[PDB]
Amino acid sequence: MAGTMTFQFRNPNFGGNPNNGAFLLNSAQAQNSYKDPSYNDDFGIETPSALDNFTQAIQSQILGGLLSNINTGKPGRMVTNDYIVDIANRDGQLQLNVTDRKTGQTSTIQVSGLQNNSTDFHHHHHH
């Protein structure tokens, strides 16, 4: 008698699902560049010979860092001209995300494994 469901079409617009490459990696030592840049780089950086697999082993782990470096934005950064020094201290590590202004490369320096603390308290002038 009653119109139970009948249409039952709700939830407008589905987005979709993404595919993944797993990126479980293998092993990358890279050893020798063999074709590294010469004369302001003619084509050395564009010849992925041995470093090829190494570069990819890094880009795979950068994907994880992207899940942290998007929650940054703290005012405690470093304003440098040729290098954008964004101090990504998140989670529990000092990740120094240096973005070059010239060519624009992401120099992500994860500071991990120092434990060398030189205690500094005043007396910054002694001869």
Q: What whole-number distance in Å separates Cα of residue 95 and Cα of residue 74?
A: 13
Task: For residue 85, report the phi and psi dihedrals to the nearest 5 degrees.
Answer: -95, 95
- Domain of 108 in residue numbering reads as 1-127
Sign of the Cα torsion 110, 86, 65, 74 reads positive
CB 76 within 8 Å of CB 87: yes
Q: Quickly list H helices, the chain.
A: 51-65
Number of domains comprising the chain: 1
Q: How far from chain centre, in Å, is Cα 45? A: 19
Amino acid at the residue 82: D
Q: How far apart are CA 33 and CA 39, in angstroms?
A: 15
CA 26 to chain centre: 20
Structure determination technique employed: NMR
DSSP secondary structure letter of residue 41: T
